[PDB]
Swiss-Prot record:
Cofactor descriptive note: Binds 2 magnesium ion that constitute a dinuclear catalytic metal center.
Role of this protein: RNA-dependent RNA polymerase that performs primer-template recognition and RNA synthesis during viral replication. Initiates RNA transcription/replication at a flavin adenine dinucleotide (FAD), resulting in a 5'- FAD cap on viral RNAs. In this way, recognition of viral 5' RNA by host pattern recognition receptors can be bypassed, thereby evading activation of antiviral pathways.
Subunit structure and binding partners: Homooligomer. Interacts with non-structural protein 5A. Interacts with host VAPB. Interacts with host PRK2/PKN2. Interacts with host HNRNPA1 and SEPT6; these interactions facilitate viral replication. Part of the replication complex composed of NS2, NS3, NS4A, NS4B, NS5A and the RNA-directed RNA polymerase.
Domain RdRp catalytic: 211-329
PTM annotation (Phosphoserine): residues: S29, S42
Full protein name: RNA-directed RNA polymerase
Binding sites annotated in the UniProt record for Mg(2+) 2: D217, D315, D316
Obligatory cofactor(s): Mg(2+)
Post-translational modification: The N-terminus is phosphorylated by host PRK2/PKN2.
Reactions catalysed: RNA(n) + a ribonucleoside 5'-triphosphate = RNA(n+1) + diphosphate
Activity modulation: Activity is up-regulated by PRK2/PKN2-mediated phosphorylation.
Topology class, membrane: Single-pass type IV membrane protein
Subcellular location: Host cytoplasm; Host endoplasmic reticulum membrane
Amino acid sequence: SMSYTWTGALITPCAAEESKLPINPLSNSLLRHHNMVYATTSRSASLRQKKVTFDRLQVLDDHYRDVLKEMKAKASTVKAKLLSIEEACKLTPPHSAKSKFGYGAKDVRNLSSRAVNHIRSVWEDLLEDTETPIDTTIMAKSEVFCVQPERKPARLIVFPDLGVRVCEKMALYDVVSTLPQAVMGSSYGFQYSPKQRVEFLVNTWKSKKCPMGFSYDTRCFDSTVTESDIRVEESIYQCCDLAPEARQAIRSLTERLYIGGPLTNSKGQNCGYRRCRASGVLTTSCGNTLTCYLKATAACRAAKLQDCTMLVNGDDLVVICESAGTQEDAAALRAFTEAMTRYSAPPGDPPQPEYDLELITSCSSNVSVAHDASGKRVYYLTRDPTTPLARAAWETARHTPINSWLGNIIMYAPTLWARMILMTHFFSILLAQEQLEKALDCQIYGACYSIEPLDLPQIIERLHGLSAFTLHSYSPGEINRVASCLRKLGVPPLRTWRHRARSVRAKLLSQGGRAATCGRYLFNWAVRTKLKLTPIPAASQLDLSGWFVAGYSGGDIYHS
């Protein structure tokens, strides 16, 4: 049972690829040490291929089947509808990868006659053929990072043609948005805004007599997912009340695509064969979450960890429980790891028990504290700012499809670093370019959105509350981490940012309107004599419903 089989053909690039950060006046005003930032390229693919190609020995036991039982029962609750081809098309991102069969994402969102007739045909074929492998393309993924303390290989993206992706949406969008919540309840991480997630963690932590927690990183999770795993997911999906055609398409998608298939490079050559999770299908986030939850829940029972609560987001897992002592927590964690390893979810970083909630990193994030205007304590979500700042420098130098910095400002608005640096840097640019009013693409939980910078104040208030503009007195841990990171990257110190912010604020106020409102609210931290901020009228009435329903990483999803 090998995760991958290779022919010798290479993972080829489609364009030329940049590795180094472009020395640029703007970039440099944010980040001086440009030689610490790199982007992944095809050149490192051979290395990723070695990490990722192995034989999986999986062995299931009583605990695993008792848990599956509970999950299938909860899935039986669910009713899911077939998306009409119209709806599926409008879910396609405008810059999605074009079809091999003579049309692109625009034609799809336009319901162009050629696109829709092809999609219809792909569907017909799905209904009638449940065994012929569906072709997937494989690419080296391009992401920027900062150089390691103690260098990362490109990740491998694997995805089917555009026509197939629209068919996935028709068959599975509703399922994939609705099921995980029903199946995992409050453990489903993607139903929560960053604030809600924090409330969950802190409340869970406080309900324990003596709390112990840990995160669990499994090594190359997609690599470890077996064909049996994928079949189990399918059976969970089939617990829904589904339209007969939906059943047929889902079965066909699982058998022809999800469990495996042939790998084709950009130059049309066969690279090999996959018998594990594809990173770029609609089900990869839902599927990872379910599978991770299923293995982790059973391992928790094997380990006899007591009063376990867990939170799961794709391959990311954190559990909080009652401590039974130092030496026995330690031993239980080894028992849990041995169970995951048998279930074919071996560890990357060996896991260690933590007794301070602030020290537990999950989704690269962690909970912290500050104080609002009234001195009241406020918990909020933060993370190490290294990657976000690296990517911010890159996006300052090279325009880009996805604007990570915008996603980061939204998700991490209350943070010390996103306020003083990210907000300040990017508003001064927009200001000078004069593109305040222009909408930009970012992503949130994998899904893509188009967002107007001048709407940031309403958005932030709605997601984080008014205190997000008044936080101060951050934790020692946060302050030190951030401080140490600016020194690391050659980022100008926070007193400089405060100075640039005063000026950006003044210019925004200058222009009145929504822009002055950005000035008032986003930059009040910057002035000595602070303003009383009162609730925004346009916030109390925002459609933020569909923002935190599910995860869609690699799912190719776009919202209005």
